[PDB]
Subunit: 196 residues, 6 copies
């Protein structure tokens, strides 16, 4: 039954869309659950600042990481999977209506490409927007020493992160994967557009 269901969902799509779904499944969803989630396991437990003031660790950790990268990548992978599901539901409803019309009439370039172009444009726009936001907030490296200058701590305090090399490696890896997806969408659009 599983095989048949798979056929039903992915049997009517482009080959570049198929390899995009492959790089979505085997390289993003598989990587996020297996290995990169445990690297952000002991985030707040190993974060250690250098003072004796009670509660300076919480405000300095909050000012260091406004949002952890795992939940940011989860929101990124949710907001780029919605238009594909919308296009699939629309083409499923249209295929069902045309099949019903075929069954009722056997007993007696259009909206699809428009929705396809719209879905591809929204996917590329959300990808480049999330890349610009991540470049604006964090950069693409983590230093082992962070300087904190927030109340109620005294003037300046030093805090030390937890394993800042492995997270740098995984940040660069997800950046490479997102750039590959952004290039592949434009490749697919120019492959489908110049056949007119």
């Amino acid at each position: 039954a599983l095989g048949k269901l798979l056929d039903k969902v992915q049997a009517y799509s482009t080959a570049g869309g198929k390899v995009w779904l492959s790089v979505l499944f085997i390289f993003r969803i598989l990587l996020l659950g297996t290995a990169v989630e445990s690297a952000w396991g002991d985030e707040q437990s190993a974060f250690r600042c250098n003072t004796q003031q009670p509660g300076c660790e919480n405000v300095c950790y909050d000012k260091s990481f406004p949002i952890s990268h795992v939940r940011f990548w989860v929101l990124q992978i949710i907001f780029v999977s919605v238009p594909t599901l919308l296009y699939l539901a629309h083409v499923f409803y249209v295929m069902r209506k045309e099949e019903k019309l075929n069954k009722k009439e056997e007993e007696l370039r259009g909206g699809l490409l428009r929705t396809y172009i719209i879905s591809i444009l929204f996917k590329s726009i959300f990808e480049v927007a999330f890349l610009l936001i991540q470049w604006y907030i964090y950069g693409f490296s983590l230093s082992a020493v962070y300087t904190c200058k927030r109340d109620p701590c005294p003037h300046q305090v030093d805090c030390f992160l937890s394993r800042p090399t492995e997270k740098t490696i995984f940040i660069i890896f997800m950046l490479v994967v997102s750039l590959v997806s952004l290039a592949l969408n434009i490749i697919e659009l120019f492959y489908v557009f110049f056949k007119g």
Copy 2:
């Protein structure tokens, strides 16, 4: 078999009801299990007050959070999924009775729209009630410093929360999702009512 079962459950519904079920599944149930649950992981472990009195942390944490937002959203998502299931069970029983009457007679605007309107009204009422309760209790922001004035602590004590920016972001996100659902229900009601 899975595909067939899905057809059986969702093949007789409105398209706005279909996109409401989509925003129920992919945006509420998927978001609650994956990312936002781990943000409320170390709630009571990282909560730290500034005193030496034994047991002031427990009473100040209790007075700060009367109920955590995760269980509140779980009760919200339970109390708005009951009338949809009731409508589906009622239309399933009516469809089974009409199919049995059709099978026994082949060998020889009404209650449905009423229940549909009732289910939509109860869904919108429970949504706006839970929004008013959450606006009354917490507001829509978390400050990093909380002042506690409860026995057996001395006069006033300061307590520091854990990562109050990320929880503010997720609170605003769930507020936007609930407002979108509340608008979509009224859109569906006015779409189905003016066809008379």
Copy 3:
């Protein structure tokens, strides 16, 4: 296959029995695993008494909670699901015997209502018994300060519980659900009895 199996288990029952099974599944089993289990997560870790005697915390925590509410509700939900399963197995065996007699004879008010009445009476009796036991042991509120008077501690010691508001809310919620089930069983009995 799943759908068919469901049909097989629940296709021959009363409609009040169907909504009782609905309030059993979606309101008791679903609520116990999702949200209310994590509220009793850090029970013994956050329980803190006010002394320096080694081991007073264990005996005072034992005298405070003779049995936690989660395991008590699990025993309550087990002891009220046995007679329904017994009635279903009995009617399945009787239906199989009558179907075998029909197949062997096509090639050529009674015990059921008695067992139904017995199952409903045992369900209501166990419900009111567990409610009386929970009213006798704990009451329906948790105070934030408990006084302990047990050896080997000195004369009287104070202990502070962990988040006593949220547990009060969930205790009141499960009480309301159990009272609704107890009323619904009597409603079903009077609905099925006055048709004679």
Copy 4:
């Protein structure tokens, strides 16, 4: 498919064997995973003795509990499920051989009751043996204060257990369940033996 498989495994057995399988599933396997496992969660973490000698806690905890009750009940539930599976595999092989002989000959009181009696006798023997062992080692109660007299601790030390009331309740509960099973096996044997 599930339903059919269930039919295949349990369609040829005695009714007392059916209710024995019911009390095996819903009362032993279901109870061990859900509630009683979490009661033995923080066993060695909350065990606290009264001294300053390093390492006295480990030897006194070892002399207190030679084997925890959870693993003892797991071994008990394994050693009483083997003869039922052996009888089922034997009757499956005999049914397959007789069905093959029937298919090869349509184209042209004995060993079963012996194995049934042997399986019932071995089940009752292992039940009463495990009950005698548990009565010999622990008794049927846990005191909150234990006296330890083992090297390298000094002369006598006091140790305090963790929640000794709840474990007493569950020990008495499993004792009642095992006595009910032991009585039911003898009831089934005398029900099947006096029909000769």
Copy 5:
């Protein structure tokens, strides 16, 4: 479908091979996941030596246990399941080739016993090799007091293990199971060899 798949995998094998597969599944894989894994849960957390030198605990724990028994039993259960899978894949390929030859010719003592003998010999050899290795490294008991004589600790230090009785019981239990399997393989070989 499950039932059919099971038939497909185990329908062509010896009865002693069937009871060997039974003692492989219900007594090794079932026992390792359920109960004996939690006994080695807090291994390094409860291991406590008697000194104040920083880092003596790590080197003394390393010299005490070169490899924990759980991973050793996992490697033992992997290295004795490979030849059975190899024999099954070989007989599956040979059965497929003979079935293809039968289908292409209906439209118009040998290698198997050799591989069977080879698989049984390799299984018995790896079993007795792992038993000799475990007898050489650990013995078959754990003492509660271990003497450590390794740098950078001072001259001799005492360390105390965690619950050394329960692990002794489980070591003796797995030894009995492995000896039963080693005897059963030779019984199966002499049962299949003297029929010539």
Copy 6:
């Protein structure tokens, strides 16, 4: 259904490819989830250096392990499974196109070996590249004493690892498995190439 699906995925492949898939599944994916993951459980919790400077442990642990071996093996097992999936998807699309041409024409040495050779060459290249990287970074042993010379610690500090024998054993084991796979790929290539 499962069996059929398995047939569909693996019924058209080489026998050396089949035993390569066997050594991929039963020896890499099975070993990584069961036993070797728990050995790297308490990595940063048991790592202990010998100083009193706050935060020297984080920078010395970061300089010791730039990336843990578990995530490195996960990236290794991902980057060698992509060309097999690409070859399978390509031969599936070609088989579907040829089957469609056969169905449309019944109603009225090439690209495959090229892709096979390309997939085998890329697999062997990525294997030897990951082996060279692991030989360059870590070596194939872990010492129990590591010397750290990084700011903001003083001149030289000693740090002690956690269980450095078991990790050495598992590193040697995965090295042996990878060398066996690298030899088997060349064996398969020379077996398929000299048949011309």
